[PDB]
Structure formats: structure tokens, C-alpha cells
Amino acid sequence: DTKEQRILRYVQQNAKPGDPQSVLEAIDTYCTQKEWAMNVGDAKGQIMDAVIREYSPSLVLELGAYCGYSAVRMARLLQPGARLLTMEMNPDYAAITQQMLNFAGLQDKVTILNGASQDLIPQLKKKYDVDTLDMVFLDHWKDRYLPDTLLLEKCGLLRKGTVLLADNVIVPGTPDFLAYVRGSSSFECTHYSSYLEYMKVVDGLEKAIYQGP
Ligand SMILES: CCNc1ncnc2c1ncn2[C@@H]1O[C@H](/C=C/CNC(=O)c2cc(-c3ccc(F)cc3)cc(O)c2O)[C@@H](O)[C@H]1O
Ligand SMILES: [Cl-]
Numbered sequence: 529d530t531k532e533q534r535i536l537r538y539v540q541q542n543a544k545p546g547d548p549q550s551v552l553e554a555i556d557t558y559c560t561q562k563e564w565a566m567n568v569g570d571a572k573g574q575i576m577d578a579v580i581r582e583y584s585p586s587l588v589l590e591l592g593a594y595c596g597y598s599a600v601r602m603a604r605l606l607q608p609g610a611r612l613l614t615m616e617m618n619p620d621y622a623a624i625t626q627q628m629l630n631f632a633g634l635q636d637k638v639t640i641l642n643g644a645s646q647d648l649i650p651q652l653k654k655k656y657d658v659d660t661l662d663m664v665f666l667d668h669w670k671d672r673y674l675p676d677t678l679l680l681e682k683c684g685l686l687r688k689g690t691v692l693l694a695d696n697v698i699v700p701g702t703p704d705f706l707a708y709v710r711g712s713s714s715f716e717c718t719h720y721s722s723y724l725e726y727m728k729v730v731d732g733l734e735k736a737i738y739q740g741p
């Protein structure tokens with residue numbers, strides 16, 4: 529058994545099917561009382577909720593689902609008919625995420641794509657019928673934030689006004705990404721200071737809005 533499987537089982541044993549908030553609470557409780565895990569957490573999660581409500585995106589991409597905590601957060605706030613695509617390379621975690629979303633009742637709003645972002649991003653247009661993305665949440669390996677931002681642009685998936693939202697810009701940090709977006713005329717950036725999930729350690733989210741080529 530893995531820690532990720534243990535989180536899923538705790539939600540199944542302690543939350544209410546079809547109630548996303550109960551799922552989020554259960555995961556937070558497990559990760560605070562039993563075993564830490566790299567979910568975005570409630571502190572940063574409340575900032576993400578405020579961003580999602582401000583922008584009301586019709587199509588969101590998440591890079592790195594993990595166990596589906598942030599996918600539950602985001603999908604529960606989507607307007608009716610809006611959609612989330614979430615990419616997760618680890619097949620075990622992809623299945624956990626699918627089951628988390630099923631449990632929460634959010635499965636009709638989300639598509640969980642099992643594969644690496646560098647493989648799946650170039651397929652979005654033709655295979656997933658994407659035109660452009662309204663919002664992207666970056667939460668995968670930190671050294672892939674910049675490569676994948678640049679791939680998304682190459683592939684034509686960013687429009688003027690696409691909102692990038694990046695986790696962990698302080699801890700662990702993503703120094704190439706952060707320097708790049710902050711220094712580029714192609715992005716307008718805002719920093720939201722917060723705390724690392726389940727810890728009294730400063731972290732933050734970066735919002736970087738694409739300005740066009
Ligand atoms: C290969 C790049 N493309 C990818 N495409 C799809 N899924 C990918 C990809 N990379 C990684 N994944 C998945 O994203 C997840 C990985 C995320 C990496 N995150 C972190 O390392 C992380 C780490 C911390 C952290 C902070 C403090 C610490 F002391 C220790 C760890 C906190 C966080 O919030 C984090 O997000 C996994 O589910 C992984 O399988
Ligand atoms: Cl998460």
C-alpha cells in the first residue's frame with residue numbers, strides 16, 4: 529500500500545460521496561494528522577479558489593494531478609459546462625485522481641489524462657479538440673514549468689489573456705520559470721504569498737497572464 533492509496537481510502541471511509549468539500553476536508557485532515565503529502569493545501573487552495581472565481585475559465589489545464597486535490601478544488605468552482613483537463617504521468621496516481629473525482633461527483637467536468645505533459649500537450653488540439661486554454665495550473669516537476677510553458681506557446685494553446693497559475697514558486701521554487709515570466713514582456717505577473725501545505729513555511733503562487741506573441 530502507498531501513502532496516496534491511504535489518502536484515497538481515508539476519503540472513502542470518512543467523506544460523503546458527491547460532496548467535494550467533504551473530500552477536501554478529509555484529505556486535509558489526513559495530511560495534517562497522519563502523513564504529510566504535496567497537495568496544494570487549504571492556505572494556497574483558498575487563493576486558487578479566489579482566482580478561479582475571478583476569471584471563470586471555460587477550459588483549464590492542470591499539470592500534475594497527483595491525488596486530485598487541486599482538481600477537486602478547481603472543478604467544484606467551474607461554471608456549468610466549463611471543463612478541466614488534468615495530466616498525470618504516474619498511472620497509479622492517475623487512477624487515484626479519477627477515483628477521487630468520481631467520489632466527489634465531479635467526473636463529468638474533468639478529463640484525467642494519463643501521460644507526461646511533453647507527450648500530451650502536442651495532442652491537445654487534435655485529439656482533445658482544444659482551441660486555446662483559458663487557464664493553466666502548474667504543479668508538476670518544478671524544472672518542467674518553463675519547458676512546458678514554452679511548449680504550450682509553441683503549440684498555439686495560449687491566447688491573449690490566458691492565466692498561468694504556478695504552485696511552489698518559493699518552496700521548492702522554480703527559479704528559471706519565475707525569472708523568465710517576471711522578465712518577459714509576454715507576461716504580466718502577480719505574486720500571492722501564502723504557506724506551504726500543512727506547514728508554517730512561506731510559499732506562494734505566481735499568476736502570469738499571457739500577453740500574446
Ligand atoms: C515530466 C514532466 N511532465 C509531467 N506530466 C505529468 N505529470 C507529471 C509530470 N511531472 C510530474 N508529474 C506528476 O506531478 C506530480 C509531481 C509534482 C511535483 N511537486 C513537488 O515536487 C512538490 C514538492 C513540495 C515540497 C515542499 C517542501 C518539501 F520539503 C518537500 C516537498 C510541495 C509541493 O506543493 C509540490 O508540488 C506527481 O503526481 C507526478 O507524477
Ligand atoms: Cl494537489
Ligand SMILES: [Cl-]
Nearest residue numbers: 569570571726
Ligand atoms: Cl494548508
Ligand SMILES: [Mg+2]
Nearest residue numbers: 568667695696
Ligand atoms: Mg505543489
